[PDB]
Amino acid sequence: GWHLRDTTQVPSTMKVMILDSGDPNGPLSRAVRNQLRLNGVELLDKETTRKDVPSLRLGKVSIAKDTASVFRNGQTAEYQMIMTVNATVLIPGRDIYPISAKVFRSFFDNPQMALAKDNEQDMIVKEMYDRAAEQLIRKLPSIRAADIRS
Amino acid sequence: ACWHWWLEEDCDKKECA
Amino acid sequence: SGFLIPNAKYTTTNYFEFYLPYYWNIAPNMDATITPHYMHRRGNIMWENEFRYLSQAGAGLMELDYLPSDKVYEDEHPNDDSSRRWLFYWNHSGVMDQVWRFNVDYTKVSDPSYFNDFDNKYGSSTDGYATQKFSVGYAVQNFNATVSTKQFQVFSEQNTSSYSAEPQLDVNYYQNDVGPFDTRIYGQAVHFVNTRDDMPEATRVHLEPTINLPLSNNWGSINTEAKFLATHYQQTNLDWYNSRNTTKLDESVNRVMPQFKVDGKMVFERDMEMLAPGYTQTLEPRAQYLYVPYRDQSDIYNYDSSLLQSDYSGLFRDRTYGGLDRIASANQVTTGVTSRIYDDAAVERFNISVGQIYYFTESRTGDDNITWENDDKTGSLVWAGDTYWRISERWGLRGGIQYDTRLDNVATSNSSIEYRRDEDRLVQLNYHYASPEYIQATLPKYYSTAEQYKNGISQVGAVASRPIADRWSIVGAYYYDTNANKQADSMLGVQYSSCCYAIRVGYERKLNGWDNDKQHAVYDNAIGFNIELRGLSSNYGLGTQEMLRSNILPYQNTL
Ligand SMILES: CCCCCCCCCCCCO[C@@H]1O[C@H](CO)[C@@H](O[C@H]2O[C@H](CO)[C@@H](O)[C@H](O)[C@H]2O)[C@H](O)[C@H]1O
Ligand SMILES: CCCCCCCCCCCCO[C@@H]1O[C@H](CO)[C@@H](O[C@H]2O[C@H](CO)[C@@H](O)[C@H](O)[C@H]2O)[C@H](O)[C@H]1O
Ligand SMILES: CCCCCCCCCCCCO[C@@H]1O[C@H](CO)[C@@H](O[C@H]2O[C@H](CO)[C@@H](O)[C@H](O)[C@H]2O)[C@H](O)[C@H]1O
Ligand SMILES: *CC(=O)N1CN(C(=O)C*)CN(C(=O)C*)C1
């Protein structure tokens, strides 16, 4: 009994919204702005004249790179990269709803082509923000469920 | 010699200079 | 500003050692810590200076360790002029006026065996190299430009030559309203220089103009992206490489090459009632055609390109290798599918993802130094699959499998299950595997030759932490390698926390090194105690996560 998605990924009360962050020119804000641009969502400037418009406040970014496996000599084999993103949605009559997004990535270390490997790591960083932005989109309408149950 | 910039594939060097 | 509580530990490398902190406030936003480290086997005092600052350029930490003399480094290195040891560390991060970004990540050691001998605070014994990065960038909403310097120092004594970017300039410009098309351009100017003087140097200039047309509906989306790659190499110091290899690098290389990519994402829903009412299952297909023409990169040295690991979201990339030296040809389609299960409150509980790449032609780049166990070139060669299940609010499991047909084996796999009541009560089991075929493929030849690398990875790890009576915290961790039937890591920690003081006792047995004479691994032990003062703030934690980071294989939370 499958059927096409007749609804929208972003809820209809969040079709126009305000993107707020402590670093608007960062890669996270660019990824979130791109991911709201692909869903047809109109974004307003910060401190606009339009009231009862819901808002996205992006919090802080935790990026960790740690050792996940070692070889028989104890040198690293796997690098686990961790991204933790916090955000709050302000529905300006109702409530502040906090959401988070945590991204797991994984790559081998090779010292002998290590600069190559670090450019690899930069590319992984360029992916993870985008994936983190998608998870924020995937936590939009549960708040809409929380907009009904309250 | 025999340089490509568009979608044509490069070919092997022992028949072309 | 004054003396802290001095604290001691006993390791097999340094025997009995102790720290005597002294803390100093220079001005508020600037503090420092000067610590004598008396070590008994090395028979001297390492001076450890930490200096933390917060300014308009951002927040930074500087570290300077100096050991003036060493008996042990005089023993196994008698021919050197001095046995001094030193560490310099600098970590700076900041954004000034929302447009200026400054990042410094600097780590320089005296000798490549430093972190196997001393404490692991800003480096690790697991680390195979030390990083020295500076980066200054200007970023506004449609334009960023970052200059950077990346130098590395390699610890392994097989080949200490490593390339460095001195400097590297990255320019990105974006414009998303040119008709229905979105345009962007990326430029890069990078100078590659190596530590050895007989190795060839280069200057790369790269331009990448890109247009794409996205279309979307309520149920699907399609994205067509056309891209150019223009690359100029100027290569010098070419005599020593051309004096001993059959292929020849050229001093001036031009490489202009297209890229065509079509992506399509498809969404179906279903109300699933046989599990619970109100639950929603979404089935998401995704397809991708990618065409990259073949250009011959045998006349280009591999400076900054490494082979990328291909997970499920890594299946859908337009690059086979990272960097810009090696760009493989592509005539491929990537097909993946993701099933998601949402609860009645539209919260995602389950997802599973499985996909594959079909290659119509061989992904070739001009040279093929990676070995394979068979000659499979076209067809369904790379398969990937991820899963995440949130069983309850306390349980969770993750899994990932990556298979390559050219390896004739599963390439990599990982799994984890975690029970977590709160910050203090947790059990985690995890498993990691990498096949030795993939070690033979993606890592160089002495890794497949030497016995400490050639067996691959198969480890089982168990982490646990439990409080007693809201004042005692007991932390354990055990990581075991099943290929050699030998352990990699052990960690224990008991912490008593009071209203104004806290005592923590930590134990760790770790893999640290390898004995090249007798051909077996080297383990070291560490038992120690820490006393810290509470009551000055609202820190009434039991210190569980600070004990969980204390080993060479850290805890990370997987819900
Ligand atoms: C980021 C910007 C990149 C700009 C670099 C690419 C620009 C496009 C190439 C046009 C360069 C003008 O150069 C002109 O054309 C070709 C193509 O390189 C050169 O031909 C070249 O072919 C190859 C390089 O791939 C080498 O064997 C050799 O360096 C040269 O013979 C000609 O000797 C020159 O007459
Ligand atoms: C569908 C997508 C979701 C799937 C989620 C991922 C699940 C991963 C399960 C965790 C991994 C279990 O580990 C899996 O089994 C064994 C080891 O036990 C490995 O198997 C390999 O090694 C063993 C012995 O060492 C031999 O049988 C053989 O050489 C090879 O098959 C697999 O390559 C690995 O994938
Ligand atoms: C779910 C979490 C579980 C938490 C519990 C796991 C952690 C418990 C601690 C495990 C560590 C004890 O493990 C044990 O360590 C001792 C330390 O003397 C090792 O003993 C060692 O002694 C000396 C080192 O001083 C070496 O010369 C010798 O070769 C080696 O055997 C044992 O080989 C190992 O079996
Ligand atoms: C210059 C060039 O592209 N070609 C096409 N050929 C290939 O084999 C790829 C035929 N050819 C030569 O053999 C020299 C010329």
PDB file of N, CA, C and O in Angstrom, chain C residues 16-61:
ATOM      1  N   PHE C  16      58.378   5.791  38.586  1.00  0.00           N
ATOM      2  CA  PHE C  16      57.548   6.666  39.402  1.00  0.00           C
ATOM      3  C   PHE C  16      57.818   8.111  39.002  1.00  0.00           C
ATOM      4  O   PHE C  16      58.975   8.545  38.978  1.00  0.00           O
ATOM      5  N   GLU C  17      56.759   8.854  38.689  1.00  0.00           N
ATOM      6  CA  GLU C  17      56.888  10.248  38.300  1.00  0.00           C
ATOM      7  C   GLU C  17      55.847  11.056  39.062  1.00  0.00           C
ATOM      8  O   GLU C  17      54.806  10.526  39.479  1.00  0.00           O
ATOM      9  N   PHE C  18      56.131  12.344  39.255  1.00  0.00           N
ATOM     10  CA  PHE C  18      55.091  13.191  39.826  1.00  0.00           C
ATOM     11  C   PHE C  18      55.109  14.584  39.214  1.00  0.00           C
ATOM     12  O   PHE C  18      56.136  15.067  38.725  1.00  0.00           O
ATOM     13  N   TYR C  19      53.940  15.218  39.277  1.00  0.00           N
ATOM     14  CA  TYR C  19      53.666  16.553  38.776  1.00  0.00           C
ATOM     15  C   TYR C  19      53.472  17.488  39.960  1.00  0.00           C
ATOM     16  O   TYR C  19      52.764  17.143  40.917  1.00  0.00           O
ATOM     17  N   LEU C  20      54.062  18.681  39.875  1.00  0.00           N
ATOM     18  CA  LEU C  20      53.790  19.771  40.818  1.00  0.00           C
ATOM     19  C   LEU C  20      53.274  20.985  40.047  1.00  0.00           C
ATOM     20  O   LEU C  20      54.072  21.759  39.503  1.00  0.00           O
ATOM     21  N   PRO C  21      51.950  21.166  39.947  1.00  0.00           N
ATOM     22  CA  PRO C  21      51.420  22.344  39.246  1.00  0.00           C
ATOM     23  C   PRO C  21      51.668  23.650  39.991  1.00  0.00           C
ATOM     24  O   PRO C  21      51.801  23.692  41.215  1.00  0.00           O
ATOM     25  N   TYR C  22      51.723  24.730  39.214  1.00  0.00           N
ATOM     26  CA  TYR C  22      51.576  26.085  39.723  1.00  0.00           C
ATOM     27  C   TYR C  22      50.754  26.847  38.697  1.00  0.00           C
ATOM     28  O   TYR C  22      51.020  26.759  37.497  1.00  0.00           O
ATOM     29  N   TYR C  23      49.763  27.598  39.166  1.00  0.00           N
ATOM     30  CA  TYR C  23      48.834  28.294  38.291  1.00  0.00           C
ATOM     31  C   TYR C  23      48.988  29.797  38.488  1.00  0.00           C
ATOM     32  O   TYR C  23      49.292  30.267  39.587  1.00  0.00           O
ATOM     33  N   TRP C  24      48.774  30.548  37.410  1.00  0.00           N
ATOM     34  CA  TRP C  24      49.063  31.974  37.400  1.00  0.00           C
ATOM     35  C   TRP C  24      48.016  32.656  36.530  1.00  0.00           C
ATOM     36  O   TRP C  24      47.755  32.209  35.412  1.00  0.00           O
ATOM     37  N   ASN C  25      47.412  33.724  37.047  1.00  0.00           N
ATOM     38  CA  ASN C  25      46.542  34.589  36.251  1.00  0.00           C
ATOM     39  C   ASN C  25      47.351  35.816  35.857  1.00  0.00           C
ATOM     40  O   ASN C  25      47.747  36.608  36.715  1.00  0.00           O
ATOM     41  N   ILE C  26      47.617  35.975  34.557  1.00  0.00           N
ATOM     42  CA  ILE C  26      48.379  37.141  34.117  1.00  0.00           C
ATOM     43  C   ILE C  26      47.479  38.370  34.117  1.00  0.00           C
ATOM     44  O   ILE C  26      47.809  39.409  34.702  1.00  0.00           O
ATOM     45  N   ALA C  27      46.320  38.249  33.497  1.00  0.00           N
ATOM     46  CA  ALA C  27      45.228  39.206  33.447  1.00  0.00           C
ATOM     47  C   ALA C  27      44.025  38.341  33.103  1.00  0.00           C
ATOM     48  O   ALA C  27      44.219  37.283  32.498  1.00  0.00           O
ATOM     49  N   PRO C  28      42.796  38.694  33.492  1.00  0.00           N
ATOM     50  CA  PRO C  28      41.666  37.809  33.180  1.00  0.00           C
ATOM     51  C   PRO C  28      41.295  37.816  31.701  1.00  0.00           C
ATOM     52  O   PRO C  28      40.909  38.852  31.152  1.00  0.00           O
ATOM     53  N   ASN C  29      41.208  36.589  31.153  1.00  0.00           N
ATOM     54  CA  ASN C  29      41.371  35.999  29.804  1.00  0.00           C
ATOM     55  C   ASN C  29      42.769  35.442  29.524  1.00  0.00           C
ATOM     56  O   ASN C  29      42.977  34.883  28.443  1.00  0.00           O
ATOM     57  N   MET C  30      43.736  35.555  30.440  1.00  0.00           N
ATOM     58  CA  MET C  30      45.055  34.954  30.205  1.00  0.00           C
ATOM     59  C   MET C  30      45.528  34.225  31.455  1.00  0.00           C
ATOM     60  O   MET C  30      45.803  34.855  32.483  1.00  0.00           O
ATOM     61  N   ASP C  31      45.681  32.906  31.359  1.00  0.00           N
ATOM     62  CA  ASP C  31      46.231  32.154  32.479  1.00  0.00           C
ATOM     63  C   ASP C  31      47.311  31.183  32.017  1.00  0.00           C
ATOM     64  O   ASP C  31      47.418  30.864  30.832  1.00  0.00           O
ATOM     65  N   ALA C  32      48.134  30.746  32.967  1.00  0.00           N
ATOM     66  CA  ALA C  32      49.268  29.885  32.680  1.00  0.00           C
ATOM     67  C   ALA C  32      49.442  28.873  33.800  1.00  0.00           C
ATOM     68  O   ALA C  32      48.991  29.084  34.928  1.00  0.00           O
ATOM     69  N   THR C  33      50.105  27.771  33.469  1.00  0.00           N
ATOM     70  CA  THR C  33      50.391  26.702  34.417  1.00  0.00           C
ATOM     71  C   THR C  33      51.801  26.199  34.158  1.00  0.00           C
ATOM     72  O   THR C  33      52.102  25.731  33.056  1.00  0.00           O
ATOM     73  N   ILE C  34      52.657  26.294  35.169  1.00  0.00           N
ATOM     74  CA  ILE C  34      54.035  25.821  35.104  1.00  0.00           C
ATOM     75  C   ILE C  34      54.116  24.582  35.982  1.00  0.00           C
ATOM     76  O   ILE C  34      53.778  24.634  37.169  1.00  0.00           O
ATOM     77  N   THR C  35      54.541  23.465  35.404  1.00  0.00           N
ATOM     78  CA  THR C  35      54.500  22.189  36.110  1.00  0.00           C
ATOM     79  C   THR C  35      55.855  21.502  36.009  1.00  0.00           C
ATOM     80  O   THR C  35      56.302  21.172  34.892  1.00  0.00           O
ATOM     81  N   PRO C  36      56.593  21.380  37.109  1.00  0.00           N
ATOM     82  CA  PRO C  36      57.652  20.371  37.176  1.00  0.00           C
ATOM     83  C   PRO C  36      57.092  18.957  37.090  1.00  0.00           C
ATOM     84  O   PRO C  36      56.117  18.607  37.761  1.00  0.00           O
ATOM     85  N   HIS C  37      57.744  18.143  36.266  1.00  0.00           N
ATOM     86  CA  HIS C  37      57.495  16.716  36.093  1.00  0.00           C
ATOM     87  C   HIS C  37      58.775  15.982  36.461  1.00  0.00           C
ATOM     88  O   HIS C  37      59.681  15.875  35.633  1.00  0.00           O
ATOM     89  N   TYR C  38      58.863  15.463  37.679  1.00  0.00           N
ATOM     90  CA  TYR C  38      60.041  14.670  38.005  1.00  0.00           C
ATOM     91  C   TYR C  38      59.792  13.247  37.538  1.00  0.00           C
ATOM     92  O   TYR C  38      58.828  12.612  37.980  1.00  0.00           O
ATOM     93  N   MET C  39      60.661  12.756  36.653  1.00  0.00           N
ATOM     94  CA  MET C  39      60.654  11.369  36.207  1.00  0.00           C
ATOM     95  C   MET C  39      61.961  10.708  36.619  1.00  0.00           C
ATOM     96  O   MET C  39      63.041  11.296  36.464  1.00  0.00           O
ATOM     97  N   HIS C  40      61.850   9.483  37.134  1.00  0.00           N
ATOM     98  CA  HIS C  40      62.912   8.806  37.869  1.00  0.00           C
ATOM     99  C   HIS C  40      63.814   7.966  36.969  1.00  0.00           C
ATOM    100  O   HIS C  40      65.030   7.923  37.187  1.00  0.00           O
ATOM    101  N   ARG C  41      63.233   7.266  35.988  1.00  0.00           N
ATOM    102  CA  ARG C  41      64.034   6.502  35.035  1.00  0.00           C
ATOM    103  C   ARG C  41      64.834   7.422  34.124  1.00  0.00           C
ATOM    104  O   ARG C  41      66.018   7.179  33.861  1.00  0.00           O
ATOM    105  N   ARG C  42      64.207   8.495  33.653  1.00  0.00           N
ATOM    106  CA  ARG C  42      64.900   9.534  32.909  1.00  0.00           C
ATOM    107  C   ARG C  42      65.647  10.491  33.825  1.00  0.00           C
ATOM    108  O   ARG C  42      66.498  11.244  33.341  1.00  0.00           O
ATOM    109  N   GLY C  43      65.351  10.454  35.126  1.00  0.00           N
ATOM    110  CA  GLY C  43      66.158  11.045  36.174  1.00  0.00           C
ATOM    111  C   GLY C  43      66.263  12.552  36.155  1.00  0.00           C
ATOM    112  O   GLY C  43      67.307  13.103  36.518  1.00  0.00           O
ATOM    113  N   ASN C  44      65.195  13.231  35.752  1.00  0.00           N
ATOM    114  CA  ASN C  44      65.275  14.672  35.557  1.00  0.00           C
ATOM    115  C   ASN C  44      63.872  15.248  35.736  1.00  0.00           C
ATOM    116  O   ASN C  44      62.940  14.544  36.144  1.00  0.00           O
ATOM    117  N   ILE C  45      63.730  16.543  35.466  1.00  0.00           N
ATOM    118  CA  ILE C  45      62.472  17.263  35.596  1.00  0.00           C
ATOM    119  C   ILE C  45      62.141  17.867  34.239  1.00  0.00           C
ATOM    120  O   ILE C  45      62.887  18.712  33.730  1.00  0.00           O
ATOM    121  N   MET C  46      61.031  17.434  33.655  1.00  0.00           N
ATOM    122  CA  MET C  46      60.471  18.099  32.490  1.00  0.00           C
ATOM    123  C   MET C  46      59.658  19.306  32.933  1.00  0.00           C
ATOM    124  O   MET C  46      58.795  19.198  33.808  1.00  0.00           O
ATOM    125  N   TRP C  47      59.934  20.455  32.335  1.00  0.00           N
ATOM    126  CA  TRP C  47      59.174  21.663  32.606  1.00  0.00           C
ATOM    127  C   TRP C  47      58.056  21.769  31.580  1.00  0.00           C
ATOM    128  O   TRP C  47      58.322  21.834  30.373  1.00  0.00           O
ATOM    129  N   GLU C  48      56.813  21.757  32.056  1.00  0.00           N
ATOM    130  CA  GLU C  48      55.633  21.784  31.204  1.00  0.00           C
ATOM    131  C   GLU C  48      54.913  23.106  31.428  1.00  0.00           C
ATOM    132  O   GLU C  48      54.437  23.372  32.535  1.00  0.00           O
ATOM    133  N   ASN C  49      54.831  23.929  30.389  1.00  0.00           N
ATOM    134  CA  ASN C  49      54.213  25.244  30.487  1.00  0.00           C
ATOM    135  C   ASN C  49      52.988  25.287  29.589  1.00  0.00           C
ATOM    136  O   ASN C  49      53.093  25.073  28.378  1.00  0.00           O
ATOM    137  N   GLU C  50      51.835  25.562  30.184  1.00  0.00           N
ATOM    138  CA  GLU C  50      50.589  25.772  29.468  1.00  0.00           C
ATOM    139  C   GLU C  50      50.228  27.244  29.573  1.00  0.00           C
ATOM    140  O   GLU C  50      50.389  27.846  30.635  1.00  0.00           O
ATOM    141  N   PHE C  51      49.768  27.838  28.477  1.00  0.00           N
ATOM    142  CA  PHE C  51      49.359  29.239  28.511  1.00  0.00           C
ATOM    143  C   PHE C  51      48.120  29.359  27.637  1.00  0.00           C
ATOM    144  O   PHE C  51      48.191  29.163  26.421  1.00  0.00           O
ATOM    145  N   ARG C  52      46.982  29.643  28.263  1.00  0.00           N
ATOM    146  CA  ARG C  52      45.699  29.730  27.584  1.00  0.00           C
ATOM    147  C   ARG C  52      45.264  31.185  27.517  1.00  0.00           C
ATOM    148  O   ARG C  52      45.355  31.916  28.516  1.00  0.00           O
ATOM    149  N   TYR C  53      44.796  31.598  26.337  1.00  0.00           N
ATOM    150  CA  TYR C  53      44.432  32.981  26.082  1.00  0.00           C
ATOM    151  C   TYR C  53      43.092  33.031  25.360  1.00  0.00           C
ATOM    152  O   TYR C  53      42.732  32.113  24.618  1.00  0.00           O
ATOM    153  N   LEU C  54      42.372  34.130  25.573  1.00  0.00           N
ATOM    154  CA  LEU C  54      41.153  34.437  24.836  1.00  0.00           C
ATOM    155  C   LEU C  54      41.251  35.891  24.406  1.00  0.00           C
ATOM    156  O   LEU C  54      41.419  36.777  25.248  1.00  0.00           O
ATOM    157  N   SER C  55      41.150  36.139  23.102  1.00  0.00           N
ATOM    158  CA  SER C  55      41.283  37.479  22.557  1.00  0.00           C
ATOM    159  C   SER C  55      40.307  37.637  21.401  1.00  0.00           C
ATOM    160  O   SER C  55      39.511  36.739  21.105  1.00  0.00           O
ATOM    161  N   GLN C  56      40.400  38.792  20.728  1.00  0.00           N
ATOM    162  CA  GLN C  56      39.505  39.109  19.615  1.00  0.00           C
ATOM    163  C   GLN C  56      39.780  38.236  18.399  1.00  0.00           C
ATOM    164  O   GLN C  56      38.885  38.023  17.574  1.00  0.00           O
ATOM    165  N   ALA C  57      41.003  37.716  18.274  1.00  0.00           N
ATOM    166  CA  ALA C  57      41.293  36.741  17.233  1.00  0.00           C
ATOM    167  C   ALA C  57      40.745  35.358  17.560  1.00  0.00           C
ATOM    168  O   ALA C  57      40.666  34.516  16.661  1.00  0.00           O
ATOM    169  N   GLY C  58      40.376  35.095  18.813  1.00  0.00           N
ATOM    170  CA  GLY C  58      39.785  33.826  19.173  1.00  0.00           C
ATOM    171  C   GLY C  58      40.430  33.262  20.420  1.00  0.00           C
ATOM    172  O   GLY C  58      41.067  33.977  21.187  1.00  0.00           O
ATOM    173  N   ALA C  59      40.252  31.959  20.618  1.00  0.00           N
ATOM    174  CA  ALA C  59      40.749  31.269  21.799  1.00  0.00           C
ATOM    175  C   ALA C  59      41.911  30.364  21.420  1.00  0.00           C
ATOM    176  O   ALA C  59      41.861  29.669  20.398  1.00  0.00           O
ATOM    177  N   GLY C  60      42.955  30.367  22.249  1.00  0.00           N
ATOM    178  CA  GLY C  60      44.153  29.620  21.936  1.00  0.00           C
ATOM    179  C   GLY C  60      44.812  29.040  23.172  1.00  0.00           C
ATOM    180  O   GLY C  60      44.627  29.514  24.296  1.00  0.00           O
ATOM    181  N   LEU C  61      45.600  27.997  22.927  1.00  0.00           N
ATOM    182  CA  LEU C  61      46.337  27.287  23.965  1.00  0.00           C
ATOM    183  C   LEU C  61      47.737  27.015  23.436  1.00  0.00           C
ATOM    184  O   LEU C  61      47.891  26.488  22.330  1.00  0.00           O
TER     185      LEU C  61
END
